[PDB]
Amino acid sequence: TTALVCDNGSGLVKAGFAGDDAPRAVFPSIVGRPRHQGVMVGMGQKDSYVGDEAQSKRGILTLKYPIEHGIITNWDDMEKIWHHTFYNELRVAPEEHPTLLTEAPLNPKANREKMTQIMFETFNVPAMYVAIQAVLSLYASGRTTGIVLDSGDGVTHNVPIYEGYALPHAIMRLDLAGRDLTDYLMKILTERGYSFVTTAEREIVRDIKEKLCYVALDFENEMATAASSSSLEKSYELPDGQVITIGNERFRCPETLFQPSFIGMESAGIHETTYNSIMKCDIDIRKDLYANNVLSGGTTMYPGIADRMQKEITALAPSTMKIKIIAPPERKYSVWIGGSILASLSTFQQMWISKQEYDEAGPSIVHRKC
Amino acid sequence: AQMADFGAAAQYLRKSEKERLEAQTRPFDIRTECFVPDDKEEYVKAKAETENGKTVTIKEDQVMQQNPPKFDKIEDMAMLTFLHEPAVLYNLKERYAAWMIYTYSGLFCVTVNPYKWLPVYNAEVVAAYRGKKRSEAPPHIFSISDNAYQYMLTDRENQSILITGESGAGKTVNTKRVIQYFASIAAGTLEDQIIQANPALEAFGNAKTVRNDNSSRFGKFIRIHFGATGKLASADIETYLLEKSRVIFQLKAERNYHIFYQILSNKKPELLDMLLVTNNPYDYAFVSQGEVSVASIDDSEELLATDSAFDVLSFTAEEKAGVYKLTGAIMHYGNMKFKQKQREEQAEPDGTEDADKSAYLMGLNSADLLKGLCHPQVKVGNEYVTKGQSVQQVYYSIGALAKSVYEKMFNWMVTRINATLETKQPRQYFIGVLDIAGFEIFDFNSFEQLCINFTNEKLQQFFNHHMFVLEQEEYKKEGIEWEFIDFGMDLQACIDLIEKPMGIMSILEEECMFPKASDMTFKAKLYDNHLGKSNNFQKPRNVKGKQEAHFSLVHYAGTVDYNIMGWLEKNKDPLNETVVGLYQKSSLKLMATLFSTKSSFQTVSALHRENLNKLMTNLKTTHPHFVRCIIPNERKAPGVMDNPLVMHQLRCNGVLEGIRICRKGFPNRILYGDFRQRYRILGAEKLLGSLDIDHNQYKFGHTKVFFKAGLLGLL
Numbered sequence A: 001t002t003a004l005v006c007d008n009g010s011g012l013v014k015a016g017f018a019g020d021d022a023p024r025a026v027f028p029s030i031v032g033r034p035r036h037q038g039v040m041v042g043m044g045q046k047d048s049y050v051g052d053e054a055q056s057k058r059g060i061l062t063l064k065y066p067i068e069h070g071i072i073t074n075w076d077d078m079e080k081i082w083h084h085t086f087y088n089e090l091r092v093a094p095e096e097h098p099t100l101l102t103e104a105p106l107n108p109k110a111n112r113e114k115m116t117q118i119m120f121e122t123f124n125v126p127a128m129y130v131a132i133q134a135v136l137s138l139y140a141s142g143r144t145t146g147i148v149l150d151s152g153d154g155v156t157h158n159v160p161i162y163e164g165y166a167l168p169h170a171i172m173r174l175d176l177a178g179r180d181l182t183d184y185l186m187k188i189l190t191e192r193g194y195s196f197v198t199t200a201e202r203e204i205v206r207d208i209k210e211k212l213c214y215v216a217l218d219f220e221n222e223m224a225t226a227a228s229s230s231s232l233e234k235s236y237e238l239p240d241g242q243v244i245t246i247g248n249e250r251f252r253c254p255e256t257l258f259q260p261s262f263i264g265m266e267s268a269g270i271h272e273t274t275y276n277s278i279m280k281c282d283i284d285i286r287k288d289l290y291a292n293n294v295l296s297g298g299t300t301m302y303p304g305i306a307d308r309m310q311k312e313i314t315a316l317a318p319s320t321m322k323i324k325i326i327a328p329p330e331r332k333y334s335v336w337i338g339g340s341i342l343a344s345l346s347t348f349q350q351m352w353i354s355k356q357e358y359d360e361a362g363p364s365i366v367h368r369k370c
Numbered sequence B: 001a002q003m004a005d006f007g008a009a010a011q012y013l014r015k016s017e018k019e020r021l022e023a024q025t026r027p028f029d030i031r032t033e034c035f036v037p038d039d040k041e042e043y044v045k046a047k048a049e050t051e052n053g054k055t056v057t058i059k060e061d062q063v064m065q066q067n068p069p070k071f072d073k074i075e076d077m078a079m080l081t082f083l084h085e086p087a088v089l090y091n092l093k094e095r096y097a098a099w100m101i102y103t104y105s106g107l108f109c110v111t112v113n114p115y116k117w118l119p120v121y122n123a124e125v126v127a128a129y130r131g132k133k134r135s136e137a138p139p140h141i142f143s144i145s146d147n148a149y150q151y152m153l154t155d156r157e158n159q160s161i162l163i164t165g166e167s168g169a170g171k172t173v174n175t176k177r178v179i180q181y182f183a184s185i186a187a188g189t190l191e192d193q194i195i196q197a198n199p200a201l202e203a204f205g206n207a208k209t210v211r212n213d214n215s216s217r218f219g220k221f222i223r224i225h226f227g228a229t230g231k232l233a234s235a236d237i238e239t240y241l242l243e244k245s246r247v248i249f250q251l252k253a254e255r256n257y258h259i260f261y262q263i264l265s266n267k268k269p270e271l272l273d274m275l276l277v278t279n280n281p282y283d284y285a286f287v288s289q290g291e292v293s294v295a296s297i298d299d300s301e302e303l304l305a306t307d308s309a310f311d312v313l314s315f316t317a318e319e320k321a322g323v324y325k326l327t328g329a330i331m332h333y334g335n336m337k338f339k340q341k342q343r344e345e346q347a348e349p350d351g352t353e354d355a356d357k358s359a360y361l362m363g364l365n366s367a368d369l370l371k372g373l374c375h376p377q378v379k380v381g382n383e384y385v386t387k388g389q390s391v392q393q394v395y396y397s398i399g400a401l402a403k404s405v406y407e408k409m410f411n412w413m414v415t416r417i418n419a420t421l422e423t424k425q426p427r428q429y430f431i432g433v434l435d436i437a438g439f440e441i442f443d444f445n446s447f448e449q450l451c452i453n454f455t456n457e458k459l460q461q462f463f464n465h466h467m468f469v470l471e472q473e474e475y476k477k478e479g480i481e482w483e484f485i486d487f488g489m490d491l492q493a494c495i496d497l498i499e500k501p502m503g504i505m506s507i508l509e510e511e512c513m514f515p516k517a518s519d520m521t522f523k524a525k526l527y528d529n530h531l532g533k534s535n536n537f538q539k540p541r542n543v544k545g546k547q548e549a550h551f552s553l554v555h556y557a558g559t560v561d562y563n564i565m566g567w568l569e570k571n572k573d574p575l576n577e578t579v580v581g582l583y584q585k586s587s588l589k590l591m592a593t594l595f596s597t598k599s600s601f602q603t604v605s606a607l608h609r610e611n612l613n614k615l616m617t618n619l620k621t622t623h624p625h626f627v628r629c630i631i632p633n634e635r636k637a638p639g640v641m642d643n644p645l646v647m648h649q650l651r652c653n654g655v656l657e658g659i660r661i662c663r664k665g666f667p668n669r670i671l672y673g674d675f676r677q678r679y680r681i682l683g684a685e686k687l688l689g690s691l692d693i694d695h696n697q698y699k700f701g702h703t704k705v706f707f708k709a710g711l712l713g714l715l
């Protein structure tokens, strides 16, 4: 019997079978409901659309995300998304498949406990497990020593690992990710005449961000070059014609990652949190943590983020250490790839939380033991 | 009388009543005639004080008694009273001296290569086995064949003839003669047809092993089908698990499949001018890892034979250049070179010459091939995404691609042979002749030896369970109320740690997946999971002066010492689906044929286990008959056999395993008349109710008395 890997994420649900090379079902984690009246009798109105079916009827729906910052805040919506994933996208029966869920570190225990209870009660899975996204990213990167910068859509975090031992006192978690960059782009576009207020228009802004934004190597002289010429201007076409052109917003949007004081945050950039997480570890392993900076997640996909990260950390770290930024072209699915690798291992089939153990212990087993 | 109708074969099947009756009456003492071990003959006859030309004194619980002269030349060794290894060895040797090359051992039909022409097949005079059961006619392979035929027509079951495959010669003639007997009884001929297609399967599936010069590295299952009522129909061959990891890597003192050196022998300049290949085998990394030439076979005449066998088949001019070009492309794969990108970890090609030649042969685009090897695509959801590949991963992909191309071409060749041998009306049943490589105990064992020994463990468990069933039926028929644990599974199922999902192969696959794994981590995991917990897994007794082994398994044919150095590199088989998509659209028609048919986890061990399950499932739906050919000596001298060689073969064949099995029940089974007559010297219950011997060493039922091994040796 095969196992299911269901890397949740706050902006994209990636599911599939343990052993495959890639997730089979990738769809936006969204639950939309019709706002408007409805007058055509006999249309066959549905209560609410999930996944990318709510992305195609985006005009008349109000889109909601049941995962805000890595924490599930609407549990019936999460149940709807899980049911969709299991039956309409994967087309399986969860009673016959162990499921490997995934999660970010340093978030409430009630999250894992409710995950376990929901699974074992309303899906009757034979077994389950809740891993950490960073360890799976390391599995997928093909190494056992490195500090992974996993930045998704709800949370950015660093987890330094050496020879297979996690250093939990150095795990740093930061609460700006793709969604906050989308909001900052939506707010920074109004200074050019374009106004996006609806959640559908938020998805449009997300696509603009994914298609045109990039990270500037040196921000100030790049800003000056943008101000001098118009060679950084590019045109995008909204889905009604009505093209728009953006200039320096292209690199002002992702710069929020390295200068989080743009959106009124007090924290440090991602480069400085990476360097601090390295400098929180023992002095004998940071030489190898420096040369294995593994990037993963969607928000780490901006063109030129590896060069800028390397330049920053090299300006921070001493002048002898070899700073290497590992940026695979498929780093958007590293968490899922590593999860399938982990769920395929023979030595792991002893780590599942079997339904019998749940019946014996209660929902509090998921973190007390596993 | 009942034997004089075999003509000139009578002297080679059964000795006359005169010579037998005068050989069953030799004066031999009970307690002063035994066997003692040795070093060069490994076992000798002796009279503790013992003498056979030299004197030796050994412990008084290591001498085994010779069988009495009443069991001197018995043709069914399950009927001896003292079942031990020297007894069986010397019974074989004694029957081979006074020329009688065939002997039964319980269920097997042991054959000895005579190296001397004997009229034991000569005319229909010796083909007069038509109906004579196993219990009546002399011990011939014709008895096995004719009983398979009779069973096929009486029970309407498919049958199988599992024959020895590890032996050098004597096996091919045995298969030829079984097929010939089947053609003769139920009579461009089928035998000549199956022999015509042989040089191609040789050139593509035969490799020079260290303990051979022409070794079949696959399992050939020749099935000859029979009509509704028993008329011979067409025959198709079905090939099973192929050692495809040989196309890449060869141990020292070995070669890969012959076709490479045959083509490369520069006997036909047209090929070496069309393949864009030179004539020096040391130029290509896939063919020259071991040795490039042997003096036991010339390559030019084998190449002519292969080309003429291709011409005999329906092969057209393009479907031969296709095969030759594919082999040349597999040759050019091995010497492609990739380098780490400057300051990065991505692989990029340095030198496109071999890429140019391989892409021009396979009918592809060189730039597209390179881009697909370096930057494979993957389907994530509904979109596509590129992927990163280090130099090691690119080399793994090239190796896996070469192996897949070679095995698909081999299967296509087998399909075309099956096609040119296919002509008849619908047919019901068949007789399969399974030929597969046997157990292997070398001085240096590796992954391939582990795979072959796993296959043979499966086959021997099959035979042991079959004998369990037959013994159960023969005990129930005679009403002998005696039940015992299953012979087959409850004895060898413990040595199948290899397959159970925590054993050797499962751990090997897990180590293939895990990051930064090596040989030392694999050894550590093996020891952590198996050392001390299972009694079959053991740490070897490494002696200073022999090859270094890492673990030892207790097989059915002894204990084998394996060396795990390099298993992770050989067990990986990651297929690149982008290059497969390039293959499916190649300009060369044969490549498109091969790859006409909502991946990075492929391993050699998993595919081997799947093919083994398939083969065992095919076999289990049949009724098996076993044949065991034996090489008596290495210098081809007829009549005399070397005892260490024959004993090694007799351990690996499974004969001594079956003897150990039969030595646990009641092997000595005698009728009531013969025992009431010969041992009347003072019905049978009363006569046996007077001796002091015992009570449980015998069992009575329905005109048959049973004896444990060693009670008819006291009498």
Ligand SMILES: Nc1ncnc2c1ncn2[C@@H]1O[C@H](COP(=O)(O)OP(=O)(O)O)[C@@H](O)[C@H]1O
Binding pocket: A008, A009, A010, A011, A012, A013, A151, A152, A153, A154, A178, A179, A206, A209, A210, A211, A297, A298, A299, A301, A302, A303, A332
């Ligand atoms: N090419 C790209 N350039 C910049 N950002 C991208 C790109 N592709 C995706 N993203 C961002 O990545 C986010 C999705 O990342 P993902 O790893 O799926 O996070 P999660 O797992 O939490 O859903 C989206 O919000 C999107 O804005």
